[PDB]
Design a protein around this ligand. Structure first.
Ligand SMILES: *C(=O)[C@H](CC(=O)O)NC(=O)c1cncc(Br)c1
Ligand SMILES: *C(=O)[C@H](CC(=O)O)NC(=O)c1cncc(Br)c1
Lengths: 140, 91, 91, 140
């Protein structure tokens, strides 16, 4: 067998964290249009049979709190886990509405030893966020 | 016994250290391309191959426009980071 | 016009920030697994799927042994980083 | 068309940089067994029809000098480019025999605008080198 077992009772969870409005003190501009991505993602993963949960404008705290809580759920009957992060960011970092959250921190909640209900199952992270400021001028 | 870092897949909207484009009304280049490729290929292709489609699309069909020379005519390539252990199919 | 960072594929022997094992006589877990999977699948599979095979192999069949508790019983997952625009076949 | 054109006259180059012995001042131990990987890789890519060139114990300088020179060659008739780096390293870095070389630096030689003969062709980099010191204790 070389393909993941996706025949469990349910496809799994699809957490979409859509941060559009940030705290003035962060100096982050609103991410206009991200609502479109959120709706789209929601519709698409809905049709892929995932249980979708949209969370909007979460603070860095709420983001961790959320991932902690999601990782502590029982995914025994689920096939996979999908987490979509829509926000500002930099290499290894995504912004909560009030500050940054390093990716590693919210990803460790789902690693083998921490989330045993997902062990051996595909953990997918889709991230729409800058990884820095370099620009690609293309060629040809 | 397997690695704790195993079975992870990070699908970045852009390459390391790079900027990531978003259209005020169409959404982010990466997301609208992703959703589009899932709709046409979820029932026909392995996930890696779908993301590759996403890459070619974002790389091919998008190019920034700005009155600001610095941000004008820019391109973007998504980045697939797989630590997956098997082929993934949504069916 | 395409991204200058496009059509790149980085096949890391290990995950980001992690150590990478090498056997004094068998070679590195990643390399010996890589070569092995290329031999059996170069003529049958797309490159991404071959590397995925490499991942499962290294993740499954290898486990460090050391008299040094700190390095004993450790695992390793390779990391595939694709910014490829098409499916790659060696035939 | 959704697959890379691999029907060019030749499969391409396969540069294998095998660093086993480092300068005492670096404090890097010899990478025993890497010779096995080098031979294996050489045999494997030979059978895949790539022109293989093995370089052993190159200094950081020689590594850049090498990549510069390889990028300046004409790859018009080649299908792809493969570069294998076997050495010590850390995140975004691989060691020449006398010091480190950040990956970005030797990779830029092959990007779209710099190496026009490879534009639109697969540029593969296989790296056997640590990306840090964290250890994976596994689970189950
Ligand atoms: C950088 O972190 C973000 C990522 C995102 O918003 O998804 N990108 C921008 O701030 C940005 C993207 N596209 C156009 C403009 Br103007 C700004
Ligand atoms: C860390 O950069 C290196 C990478 C390599 O040599 O390929 N790894 C070691 O130094 C190492 C690997 N496996 C066992 C021992 Br002991 C040391």
């Amino acid at each position: 067998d070389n393909s993941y077992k996706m025949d469990y009772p349910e496809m799994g969870l699809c957490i979409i964290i859509n941060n559009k409005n940030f705290h003035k003190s962060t100096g982050m501009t609103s991410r206009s249009g991200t609502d479109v991505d959120a709706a789209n993602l929601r519709e698409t993963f809905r049709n892929l049979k995932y249980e979708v949960r949209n969370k909007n404008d979460l603070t860095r705290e709420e983001i961790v709190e959320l991932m902690r809580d999601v990782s502590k759920e029982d995914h025994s009957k689920r096939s996979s886990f999908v987490c979509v992060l829509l926000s500002h960011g930099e290499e290894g970092i995504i912004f909560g509405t009030n500050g940054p959250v390093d990716l590693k921190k919210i990803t460790n909640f789902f690693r083998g030893d921490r989330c045993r209900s997902l062990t051996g199952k595909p953990k997918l992270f889709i991230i729409q966020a800058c990884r820095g400021t370099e620009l690609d001028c293309g060629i040809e | 016994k397997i690695p704790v870092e195993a079975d992870f897949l990070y699908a970045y909207s852009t390459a390391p250290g790079y900027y990531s484009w978003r259209n005020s009304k169409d959404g982010s280049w990466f997301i609208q391309s992703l959703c589009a490729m899932l709709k046409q290929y979820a029932d026909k292709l392995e996930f890696m191959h779908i993301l590759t489609r996403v890459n070619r699309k974002v790389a091919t069909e998008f190019e920034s426009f700005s009155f600001d020379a610095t941000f004008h005519a820019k391109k973007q390539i998504p980045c697939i980071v797989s630590m997956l252990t098997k082929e993934l199919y949504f069916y």
